[PDB]
Write a protein that binds this ligand. Sequence first.
Ligand SMILES: *[C@@H]1O[C@H](CO)[C@@H](O)[C@H](O)[C@H]1NC(C)=O
Ligand SMILES: *[C@@H]1O[C@H](CO)[C@@H](O)[C@H](O)[C@H]1NC(C)=O
Ligand SMILES: [Cu+2]
Ligand SMILES: [Cu+2]
Ligand SMILES: [Cu+2]
Ligand SMILES: [Cu+2]
Ligand SMILES: [Cu+2]
Ligand SMILES: [Cu+2]
Ligand SMILES: [Cu+2]
Ligand SMILES: [Cu+2]
Ligand SMILES: [Cu+2]
Ligand SMILES: [O-]
Ligand SMILES: [O-]
Lengths: 552, 552
Amino acid sequence: SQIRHYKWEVEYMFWAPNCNENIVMGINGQFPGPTIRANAGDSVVVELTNKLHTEGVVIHWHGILQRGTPWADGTASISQCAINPGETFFYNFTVDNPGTFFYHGHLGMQRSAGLYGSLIVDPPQGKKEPFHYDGEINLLLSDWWHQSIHKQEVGLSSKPIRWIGEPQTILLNGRGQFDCSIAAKYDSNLEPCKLKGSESCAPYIFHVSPKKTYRIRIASTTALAALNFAIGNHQLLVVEADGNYVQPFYTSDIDIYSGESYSVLITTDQNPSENYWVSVGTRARHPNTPPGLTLLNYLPNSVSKLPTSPPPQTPAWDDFDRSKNFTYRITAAMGSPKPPVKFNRRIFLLNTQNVINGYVKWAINDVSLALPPTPYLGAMKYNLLHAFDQNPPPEVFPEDYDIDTPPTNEKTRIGNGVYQFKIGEVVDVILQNANMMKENLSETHPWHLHGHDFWVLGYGDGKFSAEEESSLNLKNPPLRNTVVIFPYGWTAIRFVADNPGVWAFHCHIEPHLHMGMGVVFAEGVEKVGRIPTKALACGGTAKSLINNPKNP
Amino acid sequence: SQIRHYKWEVEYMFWAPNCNENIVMGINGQFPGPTIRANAGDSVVVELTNKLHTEGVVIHWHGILQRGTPWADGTASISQCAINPGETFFYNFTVDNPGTFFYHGHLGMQRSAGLYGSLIVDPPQGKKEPFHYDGEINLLLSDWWHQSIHKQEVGLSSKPIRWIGEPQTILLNGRGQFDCSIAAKYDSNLEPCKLKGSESCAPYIFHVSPKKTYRIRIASTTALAALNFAIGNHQLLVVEADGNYVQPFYTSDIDIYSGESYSVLITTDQNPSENYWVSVGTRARHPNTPPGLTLLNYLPNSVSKLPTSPPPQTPAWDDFDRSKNFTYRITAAMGSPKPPVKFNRRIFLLNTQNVINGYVKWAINDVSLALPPTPYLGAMKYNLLHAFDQNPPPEVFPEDYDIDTPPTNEKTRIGNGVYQFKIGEVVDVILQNANMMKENLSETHPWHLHGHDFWVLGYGDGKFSAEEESSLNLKNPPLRNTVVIFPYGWTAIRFVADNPGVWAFHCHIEPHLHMGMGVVFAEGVEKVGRIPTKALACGGTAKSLINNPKNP
Ligand SMILES: *[C@@H]1O[C@H](CO)[C@@H](O)[C@H](O)[C@H]1NC(C)=O
Ligand SMILES: *[C@@H]1O[C@H](CO)[C@@H](O)[C@H](O)[C@H]1NC(C)=O
Ligand SMILES: [Cu+2]
Ligand SMILES: [Cu+2]
Ligand SMILES: [Cu+2]
Ligand SMILES: [Cu+2]
Ligand SMILES: [Cu+2]
Ligand SMILES: [Cu+2]
Ligand SMILES: [Cu+2]
Ligand SMILES: [Cu+2]
Ligand SMILES: [Cu+2]
Ligand SMILES: [O-]
Ligand SMILES: [O-]
């Protein structure tokens, strides 16, 4: 086991992801950030210096469990106080298992500004992957707006709210094209991009040799878009989801929601004289963004040798039965950890879009989360009972609530209480979707849990009831860290509260988390060790711990 | 009989139709143009002064037959030379039958620039309409782009072609809204308009009293958009179409393609305590334009009092079965002229989208129309045989043509020949639609005939075959001047070549006309009287009528 050390600086910089200049948040002058790669069992040390002028910053390592290091999870106001301008903080954690992961900003909407990159973990040295491939291609998906993130944040907090709208561009490894298409030859209504291939927005080409097998790692840090990935003429064999192996299955395209990572295998068994299209299109929302496009370039064909076919047409955005068909087919690989069969706690979380005092907010069992200035982890370790609400938040919603109709907003409040578990509890969480404020509308929400993987026990339409208990999968359920709820449906997950610390469970669409769509879970904080002083130096924790008497 | 005399000047002016300023082509300082209202049998005298600086101008009176006066049709390079900067021209013509008509620009793409307005012809003096209503409402529909008409024209004449794209705003009597919605109340994601009611883009509100019946006259002069009209909680009785009366029927909404006009009656039955939504949305092309909206305000309710329901959602753009279900209902009112049972001429016109010398052109039986600098009517009256191509244009296409495949463009050319008819022939035209350059695309095209109304004999899917004869309606076919061809289908029309003159038959979508999609018919030209000198004053006709010898 090696210690992988990174020395990083976060600073804004002019950059043109889609060849239209804007500012991006870069790490050591790079957009996307540098890839961390390590082998399971290695320690990763990141010393991060904040070189933003007035903003604090944190980095969250999505999919890493932070077992023994809950302070290093990178969540402002939950695991730590944000890092101030000109300061250096050390994130020191172990990577326990192989998988496609990534990192992103977790303070305000900084991740939408560009703060993200890959974190890949290979098997322990000497050990190998359960499947063979010759090469690897790594792909990070994100979306991009030409409006400022600070204008987006202010607009989401105004009365009337100003929605951010559909992204202008889908970024594949940091690059995308706006107002022109690299596939304009198939339709004279499209404007041709004039690109020599050297530009910042020039496509990241996938170069493959004929008759080989490649693992394509795909992760999504989109702020809003749900995307569908497809390669012309090539089948994809799904072998990994969220750092865990799934029972393999072929598919023509995959759906991928913000927070998810997959590994797909392909084989370059097609006609070697041509190149093929890779298309990443928007689904689950009415599309207003052109697809992200690149080439699967079979070497030695020139990359300017365009495919004979158009890019694969994206599946219809609203065919949620097609979406469920893909999603329900995901099961744990043969030999994986099976869930505990009985639970100790089951919580029901109703997901609504509400209006709290003129403002459109999202709420979970009528509580829209407002995060405190004192980090929950420090505050619970030092038993600071005034830093946030001690009253247990609701574990059920009313059985007379009608999920087919808009909310009345009668009791909807803002809060910051924490659900508390005893170390060792088996917890089931039933997520229930419902109609939004507009009549006859409900959307998909990807939910992500920090510091744990969970088994996805099942999905269903309408309101969950006791009739549905027998449908829950306890044999084969996949272990994931992100899961979707479909329009008007429910999703059930189970996990064991065995990781000391304070962990959020929230929708991974960034405007939704900004509008309060999340809850905070805490377990065994009595067993948490020493927290770095920089993670404690703000709020109530700096107040109680800085000895500065008066008269003494 | 009465002479209506209009004194008119056309001049560009600054105007903001959707509250974004641009230049509009106004008549007598107003946009849209003044309404002409007369009784059938009157003579309209319009003396037009061209106050544009470097551009010529012409006005076409859509739907008026120009019986006796082919020179006043207002088609540059067909009926007349364009009127020069600083010159006045008189258009004198009789309005023969009552209806809802309109006028628009017919030189370059000048009508897209705002040159249009209403022409309503009432019944002969003393006579009454065949139906009762207590009031009438006049609506003219158009669409609006923010780019210049001349940057659009250069874009469509360029290699590679720069397509104009979907409109930014649908206009309802010259007003529409951009980037905000007057119906934002039903959806948080929309931006409210900050309108007082006084602005240039404030909606023309329809004021009605309860328990009455009104005739809403609706005409379309859009350059591109096919629209759908619907009023919340009000069924429509279709009673007139293209100046002629149809067999009445009820419908919840109508489709209207460019160049058509309708009259619909409604009764204000619904609850008098509220206002209802009028909604005009895009159909037939994938929409990227917000609906044109206004209120049916039931007096004395305040106009700030919104309806309790959202605007009616427009029917799906591509439900062509739904479209045909409406279109195929229209039949002539009993008492109307029945067609000649036998025809003397049948022509087959294949509509394709081609690439001629790198330019994307539209063509009819592989000839893309390019108009000559000499006006056809002048050319043919003076028998100037070198002024255009005297060879007959193609009257049939290859029966071995695959209408499901892109064209090859092998023999596609540009030309300017004319189909000539003997005065009195019963001419049959079958318009055949086909696949465009993009694989698997065929669009609707509104075709309009000048100087005539035709009977719409039938419509069919696929290629017309002679075995199709028994479906053609010779019993009740409607009299129209504009008709659509649906994707991959044919439409058959019949008319009588009884009006001395040169007349066009073209696709009424303004870009397609700019790209060559139309034909020119001429009949009985030796029966045309004296043409106005200004109409003759250009090209070959000026050259051969100006006596200017040399040495003298
Ligand atoms: C993190 O690792 C660095 C380098 O080994 C060490 O100096 C620092 O004290 C460590 N801090 C924590 C909280 O482990
Ligand atoms: C048109 O009518 C006006 C008014 O009667 C007359 O002065 C003008 O000469 C007429 N011109 C034509 C071409 O008929
Ligand atoms: Cu994340
Ligand atoms: Cu995470
Ligand atoms: Cu759409
Ligand atoms: Cu969400
Ligand atoms: Cu998070
Ligand atoms: Cu016309
Ligand atoms: Cu017209
Ligand atoms: Cu057309
Ligand atoms: Cu015309
Ligand atoms: O995470
Ligand atoms: O016309």
